[model samples]
Target: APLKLNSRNLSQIAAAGGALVKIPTYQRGRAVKEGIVHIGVGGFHRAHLAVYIDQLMQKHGVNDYAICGVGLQPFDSAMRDALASQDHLYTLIERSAKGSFAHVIGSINSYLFAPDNREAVIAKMAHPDTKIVSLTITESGYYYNENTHELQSEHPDIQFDLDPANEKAPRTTFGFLYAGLTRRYQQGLKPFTVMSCDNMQKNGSITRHMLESFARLRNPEVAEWIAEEGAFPNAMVDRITPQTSETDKTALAEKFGIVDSWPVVTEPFTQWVIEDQFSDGRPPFEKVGVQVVKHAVEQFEKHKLRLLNGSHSALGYPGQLAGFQYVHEVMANPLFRKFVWQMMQEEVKPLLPEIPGVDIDEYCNTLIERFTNPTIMDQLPRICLNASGKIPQFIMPSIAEAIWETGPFRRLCFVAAAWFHYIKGVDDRGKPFEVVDPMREELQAKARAGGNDPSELLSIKSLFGDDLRNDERFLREITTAMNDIARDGIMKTLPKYINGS
Candidate 1:
């Protein structure tokens, strides 16, 4: 029965339930070229990049371009099992207000669970066919040292690399990548393009800085070669991809009339902007709607950071404090909806760099609509709950800029107040809230210390960082906002500043 349900053969899959599916005539596919080796093959990868690559292959007959998914962590075993069963066959469900459609993609040709097969992963990375090494390792995966802007060599994982024989060694993405590159260097093979698809400021530069730092420590000769030959193209990738739930799987099966073990559902909107720098080779992504630009860093700073990510954070903290679960639910709330748009207009837009072809007002309007899309059920806690690690990179720059350029960010100040208030371990309803972050112990200690004094709260050197804390303007605005939040809850406090009440 399982064999009948899960088949790797294209004909078998078609016969089981896929033959009746129809693809739109207007959708164009590009040729594949065996150009990209994507790391961290998760739901977002399946729903977003793989779908684009699949379309490219279908239209262009570029068969060489295929994905070799390298899973580095233990949790990746589940993906390996599921994908192995289906012969790497998976369906992507694209949802819109009008309706929805499903497509089975075969772009992923092979998979290697790095923990189980580290040598195989390294070999593939060094292979001539692999021209690009792209990653979706999330925000914290980079292991950034905020003060140094380089890889944190002191990280537990880096420590593990230095002592591979240690039983309790901490293996990390950085370690895995370093090992693979070291193998390549030893074999006289050229390094591939390193593309980072995470939502961080100057992500490509940050990734390169980390890897180069590791390379320098591992071997200076290899580091010099890497500096000359390696290419880390900055990128900004956007798509609201939530983890698939049983409800989503069941709804998909019922709607499509077929059982799918791994079905990825996502919002119809997606954007990829990349700096056109590749050392070896790259797929013809431009043929499939991916924008290749030289000024990706500037573009990302304006569009991705100020407009998309900033608005998301603005909505996330306030939405969670207002007792909403999903982002769509928050958008549906009249008060939250108004607050999000107003923050973008009054607080965020002014700080953004003036880039041609980017209308801040129009972009904000589109972002609001995308956030409200019923199909994009992003969880509030998932977004707001990672405050300690996420806020500094994603939201703080804008807040800092707003204060410097325009005196103080009233709305952003309120958002910071909301974060401090939310992290106090109690919601507006006096319900216990769980804090999810790497610095949980320290944050809990700070939160439990129980201080109404804003200056004392902002003095936490860990969260605010010393440079930001010492800035008088930054400290003053944040302290004032925290004082207000202490007096009035986030819900009562946010709207008053948002509407200037």
Candidate 2:
């Protein structure tokens, strides 16, 4: 009854204008134009970019780029339902040292579950008015093969989509993208910018590669066109948007009388450094404090990925092994702090290029303070969500570069050993905890298959890759660290490494 969503209730929400309701009824009078259609309608999209547009829309006009959230998977049908029920209106809660406050965002004008209506999803992307299409499909969704530098085209989804029979009504995002682009190419429409909002090194480049790879498999002509015409901008996005709970929803309903089915509870600080290169039009992100970098996007992305994201991945596993649950709690320990600091200064930062106004040292120091902010409660387990992916992207790049340049690997080895122990699913003191990771099952099996040997985790050829097997120094360091963990303990191994012993 009251759960139903419509224009009438939305008008009521707009009418209830005050501190919380920033949008007024007058602005909702005109039918908003559709300029952006974003895939992966999850928490991060709602908190970060959607909020940006909500603010931007308030500044701009009703004919600006309103978001149309796309749901690719079956689970996304649930998201579609929730957002649809709430009239695509959600609450954005900013939590910080100061306190917590809710901002009701009405940026996402519409949503679509792709599986439910594949044709519409394809048609949406193919539309001329849809200037930009963005995605936060995460690392795994790219379906990338670092070994081959391509989107695994033989992937079942790709295989299915590439087939001629499924051209009209396709399944995967790659399918929709290929179909959409082909349709647009036949009609001679300019291709939309394929923006990747996911946090990865050269994320835009990765997006282009994967999409092109998928397209080439389906149709080489379209693949070539996208390569020359499509815009993929590298961006550095920073916002510690915490997971929203039922308690948060209840709080919003009770305190603010806003019963948003899905609300985003996040921290105050937000930064978006987008490379100013959109073929179709783009909003003045610079005016809104978004650093639309001209020539130095690579520099900006590298700093965040290596220093902030890399450090987060490096310490998470070790922190979990040390019986620390949350990130701040782990960071509370001086040993953990020193270990991360040593790893960054010795291994990561030395390899990084400098930013214009940013102090690398103070940045590192600020990272530690942020991790220890007691309020953030960033879970180590969450950080360890996709360790296989994180290690390769965050930690190993430094290791590979360092190994190439003949740099330090002692603490890198220590951190890696801790990861192995964490995946083994039991702490040194014999405390059992559910080790959350994408590769959890296989890792546990590997550990159980061959207990306590350095090979237990190292032999995951996929993780370490063939290079480490041949590279004796990396092999030796990781083995030495693993052996020490078995002999002494995790924290015990770190002190010696941090002191360069």
Candidate 3:
């Protein structure tokens, strides 16, 4: 058997030709200062940001900006064990049609399992040298109420975490952020820039708003302090990195004779468009391929959000109900492929502005290629996770903009209806799957009771808001599409509108 991957075996890894990238793990571990305390320690962050930092440390001599991986929930236990056992080191495999490149990323030199030791996580975030307190806690973690694009002040999680008395025992990101920032304030230290890497419109502003909202409930003084000092830079991050699975872990051992317990496998593509607005200082990301743009975060994010993420929401639904398990499976189907293309070209693309030098047409084509990467195994259910939040952020903006502007919304509505269909929890082949969502029970229940009529599900103020639910014309199109999907199934209904008839 190959040597188990621990800090002890890192040397063996290099000797066996399995050390894909520069093994600076133990070399720079002691000297590297923790500058970033990332909340979500997952594959996407590992493959994307960690890779960039690894390059900077090895090439650019960024000696003090190494990441300290912080895992918040029970879900993070596995990640903590994997990286901790390896001394905060793991391999990142970038898969592509040409080939694959594996690297033992050494940027993450430390980790904090918050569930076990929350104080350590706070100390890392509130550390004076920690210039950027970044986050990849998916949009759902914000406790956002989509109806108003605001924080849910009434959410039980937020409510529970609000009391200053419960500051040390925060259960949500909002709580952790508030508690950490408050600690920094008490010490008279400069607050770190809170950069939200989640894919959403005005994500920076949203983070500030949500963090402030949570803080105000605990301590108004802290809320006011963060508002006056902290900066949350809006960002757009792209890379079709799939959820790390057991198979990925096994492959590292068998194929490379390297054992990475929680290796990240992704398509050979990554892009980051940050707002270039940090309170104190940033990682000089522009020096290392990150688009540290000026006044372009809003435009850049909307472009990616509406085009890439919007279309992802569109494709996921019909794909999920069509009995497809993975994104590539749906991309393989001729009819589904055509629907995705024409929908982007004819509907979504018209609304987007020129994204600098990017050829929107070429970008759209590239998205299709990335989406269909068979090795990534971008699961349909993963995209289907937070419809309430995703639809509002990724799917609804296109429809809402179309409605207010009096443009074509039929294809967009078709996808929205597909979302409604996806909520029903039963696929075209009459197979039932768990609807993994924040409102899973509510959505599945409403979907089951509504029959073919979509009014009940669409009217949820928290999901689509009043504009979409109230617009007579918009409602009509969605219902018609929903009925068609309910009757003939998505695989057949997909061809009807995509055929250009």
Candidate 4:
């Protein structure tokens, strides 16, 4: 039978359902220092970092550090409503092959919808307790200029920030952050650490460049102040938090008898590697599971990028085209499994720098095991659908490295070809596949106009940067590979070229 409990008896009900619930408290030391203000309060934030903060609070009774979640877009109303209903109490469900465990997270002290209360958000940024500004706005959220690593001035968000009075102006993440920083400066508050949790090469440096560039446009003095005072810490955060469906919600209600409005489900595995740089304050995260170190960026590039995301991208499109629905299902296939293993061995491993305590090969083996965990069914389209924005950042560096070091690219070439083929809007069965990319129309037009001419598609300088898109060798290699993929399907083409079958 289902158990019904009010807010007061929620703890007892949770215990009966095999979960633990905690009430919020504002005292210091139990929460740690009021260190980080997380920008995006999505599933990943709840499943990953917030979980660590909850642990810190429980283990050490540190109550000072609390996460102030700020959301910008209109869709955030759902999250705001859910969190408000429970006093920011939400469940973090970790699924493993062995079993599942659920816990109620209490690390989030408060949330503010920026659209509803922009002024309040700016005031929060200027507060003394807020020492760090962290983000999980994803790759597209950065609004970067590809060639310069600066914020795109013409971006709608920048335009909106430039003319705050204009009703038609577009709002960007960079613009919001810049506005907040400007307020902080005016209030005589010290600059806080800017931490980026996005998966980009040299993410911290890139963020610093973008913020400073935007700040300079607003005010040169302010830009200089920010550059000199603030710290941008590079970080690697990993956890496969899949989008929850009604089925998942139903299952939660049926099994646990808890009607959670916003529940996050993820794989059992998780990791966070952060640079140890905090200007005003920080949580004692090292007391929990987070690894704080100097060379976090390097460690992240080697382990997180190469081992997990790299292979995930390599597997995504092909798995989708091959009609596999979930990542674990793709791993279940012998051909796809072999393809990932060979690619990692022949293409990815040589490009990575070795981490001190981590064994790269063993880590890759562990990643494979994690991918195959049946309890967490991460969907293929969720990974593959965002390829237009994701692939260049996550996969291209490795491809470039393979071309530079190996002289002749083998597996890397096929992966590029697979991406091109995937973008063409058709599957192996010759059925029309819905292309889900931000640049879908642009890519589709190029694909249809170019037909099977890979060079024509590669020549679109905007997609690849001007340098690489125009490079004769790269164009020739990628075009040739794309043509080969058109001639042969992924499974046959991969094994034939990669293994010389």
Candidate 5:
């Protein structure tokens, strides 16, 4: 039988490991103090941030930033249960073409299910020991309009928490944060810095906006205090941690003799670039391979959004249409690989601002290698999901600038056209797949209605905007690309685009 994971079993596991694993050498008992409360302890959180903190404690003998994981949604109960049973200790397996490495991460000191005791969760945040409260609740958790950047006050969860009757039993993060901050204000405790580790551009600013919007309606005074005193630092967190499957678990047990539930499986690559804005004290994240910047984090954010994320979509949509199921499969093709590289260099790179200490060529080359990693098996459909949200953020900036500035945007336009073909719900192999997007119905309807022409999809004011609709040159380019895709299929169509014939 494999060793079960817990503080008690740590020694046994350290001694009985079949595969070489890095066990925590630092004592986790009295040395570490819980200073950070992380919301939404998903796979990425464990793999990226948690691992960083764990290393800080292990390598630097720093112990003030141990994290308390919180799950606000009812769905979070699964995480709470799993981590609780494991005593907040789980295996982190980093896989790449190079090899596999396993490590036990003990950075998360405790777990709290908000629904079980909302007061306790608030109390934890309000606790004087906690200096920073970070969140990985994802983009949807912010509850703001994507286009207008306004708070969705009418959202049912917002409404539920806003009602005075349900104030004690809060529904969303805003509710809990409001109650906690209000308590801190009344007690004269310094407010905790609210750090967002989500993938959104300007995530920190958006978080402050949503919280202030929520608090103003509930209590204007509290809202004012939040705005005046609080610090919401924008952060760009990157790591590709796919959801753990049973196969991952079986491999861990069989290969490493580590029987741990809810372990995080991810690629070897990880990066965190964050602004140094905090209400109170913060961890020395710079000591642990984190890129800490003063104010120019946006440059890093835009660079990532345009190049890495944009290229993912650039390869993803066409790769899916070309009957490739995984990112590696797509990149394995020389044409698709070259096309992704060219799109980044020829189109996207020219639009990016000069980022300090970053070599664009090196970064794009790294992306090519990362995408080509076969062990990751990163699914294409996952990359293609939420096109309506992703396109405007990832690909659209290049398209927007290229169309107006008269730059090299032919490849960018083809990516947009590929999206139009993607939503049609049938691959070139005649296999049907579900189009997973918020605007799927409208998009699918429009795609089916306009087969060879992209005008109907491009007419979406919110997505493509009127700019693309009005440009005859842009329209002609994408329509021609769409026609080529429809006639020659994605695989055959790649050569002409890649070679620029």
Candidate 6:
């Protein structure tokens, strides 16, 4: 019989002969207390932060940094049902070309679905035991305007949250944070540290600005106190955690004899570079392989954004256009792999700041290995989602800097052209696919209408910017690239482009 994962059955599962799964060491006798309240509990959070805490508990016997997850969205009901039923226990499966490794993470002792009891969620956050409130709610959840570098108070969610009528029942993350902070302030407790694990550059500083901006609108005096006392330490997080699938569930039951409702599948490599700035105390994260540096957070953030994320996006559109399905498939092709590598070296590396101990080439090599890992099966469309938002952040900055500094940027131009072709909705094989974006309809319409000409698509001043649109060198290179792809397709265009023909 397959073992149902929970606190009660942990011993039976651990003791079962020939079991390949690894169970936590401290789960039997030690009771881990919750000191952190995490906002989003998705696959990345499960595989990254929760795994680190589990290691901390197992190796060092430190139990105070446990997480009590909060699910603010209604869709998170699924996570609550899955974890809450199993005593907040779940499996984390790491996969690579070699094989698979499974471990059960027990750092999250409890989870609160916020829509069920908003007041209870606030109460949990306000509780004195909650020293840190971390978030992996993605960059979109922050209610921040990237252009203005301020809180988007005019947004409907922010407006709804700011209304005094809905004070007890909050709608947004900021509203819940304000409610909890006000409660803590009224109770004469210091505000908990707010740590952002999102993939954005300077995530901590942005979180602080967004929260303080929201708090100022609700209660100015409390906002003053929060700004004075609260801490938001910037962080850089890396891991290729694909969404959990039915195949993973079946594999766990068959190969490992463990039944898990929501097991996170990830690549073997993981990294977390964090700043040592916190309002309250923190976990001994560095003990369990976290890079806890004092001031190099931004440098690491820029490094990962430009090299890893930028290359992922670079591979996505063109790879899909060439009829590839997964990231590993793209990396498996020598031409595509070499194209990504060349783009990184030629366009991105020289622009990056030098870190203390990191070797840029080795990092690129490791990234390629992670991408080529067969078991991860990272889907192409997932990476292609929100291309417009990502292009400006991840891919464009390198091109922009290259233009300003007069660097070799032909491959970068090709990546941009590939995105235009991807938006046209049909691959080289004459198979149609939907373009996924918030601006999908508008972008698709423009891309379809543009044909071989890039003028119509580049006119979207919001995305491409007037600087790039007006640059004759950029237009000449990208137009030539687009025309070439439209004529000979991505596969043909890549070889000649890489060969400087």
- lDDT score at residue 180, model 6, on the 0-100 scale: 93
* Model 6 spans with C-alpha error above 4 angstroms: 17-19, 28-30, 499-501
lDDT for 32 in candidate 1 is 36
Q: Which 10 successive residues of model 4 have the least lDDT summed?
A: 20-29
C-alpha RMSD of each candidate structure in angstroms: 3.9, 3.2, 2.8, 3.4, 1.6, 1.7
Candidate 1 regions exceeding 4 Å error are 1-34, 162-171, 182-188, 465-488
Which tens-of-lDDT digit does each residue in 1-501 have in candidate 5? 787888888888888873667788787756678899998989889999999999998888778889999998878999998888888899998889977778999899988998898889988999898898989998889997977888898899899999999878897888888888999999997879999889998999999999989989988988898999999989888898888889889998887778888889899999999988888798799988999888478888888899889989988889888898899999888898889988899999999888767889999999899999998878888899888888888987788888888899888888888888888888888888888998988988888888788877877777777777888888898888899887878888877777553
Runs in model 2 deviating more than 4 A are 1-30, 217-221, 448-453, 470-476, 491-501
TM-scores, each model vs. reference: 0.88, 0.89, 0.90, 0.89, 0.97, 0.97
Q: Taking the candidates one at a time, how many backbone clashes does each contain?
A: 9, 0, 0, 16, 0, 0
> Higher TM-score: candidate 1 or 5?
5
**Candidate 6: pairs in clash:** none
lDDT of each: 0.72, 0.77, 0.80, 0.74, 0.87, 0.87
Q: Model 3 — TM-score against the truth?
A: 0.90
The predicted structure with the larger TM-score, 2 or 6, is 6
Q: Is candidate 3 or candidate 6 better by TM-score?
A: 6
Q: Which stretches of candidate 5 lie over 4 Å from their true place?
A: 29-31
Mark the regions of model 3 whose C-alpha exceeds 4 Å error after superposition.
Answer: 18-26, 145-175, 182-188, 213-225, 499-501
Better of 1 and 3 by lDDT: 3
Cα lDDT of candidate 1 equals 0.72
Candidate 3, residue 121: Cα displacement in angstroms equals 3.2
How far out, in Å, is residue 438 in model 6? 1.2
Question: lDDT tens string, model 1, 1-501?
Answer: 212223324445444445444332222224334567788888888877887778777786666667888787788899888787766667777766656666777777678887786667767777777878888888768889767676777777777775657322226766666666767778877888888877777888888888888878767887887788899988778887777788877776666654567778888888888889888877788998988887646665566776677677777776776677877887777777787788788777777677767688888888888888876568887787678866766677777676557544767766776777677767766677777877777766666574644454566766665556667776677677777766765667665765644
Taking the tens digit of each residue's C-alpha lDDT, what string does model 4 give over 206-302? 8888888887876889899889888888887888898887887677667776667887898878788888876666777788888888864666666
**Cα-based RMSD of candidate 3:** 2.8
Ranking by lDDT: 6, 5, 3, 2, 4, 1
Q: How many backbone collisions does model 3 have?
A: 0
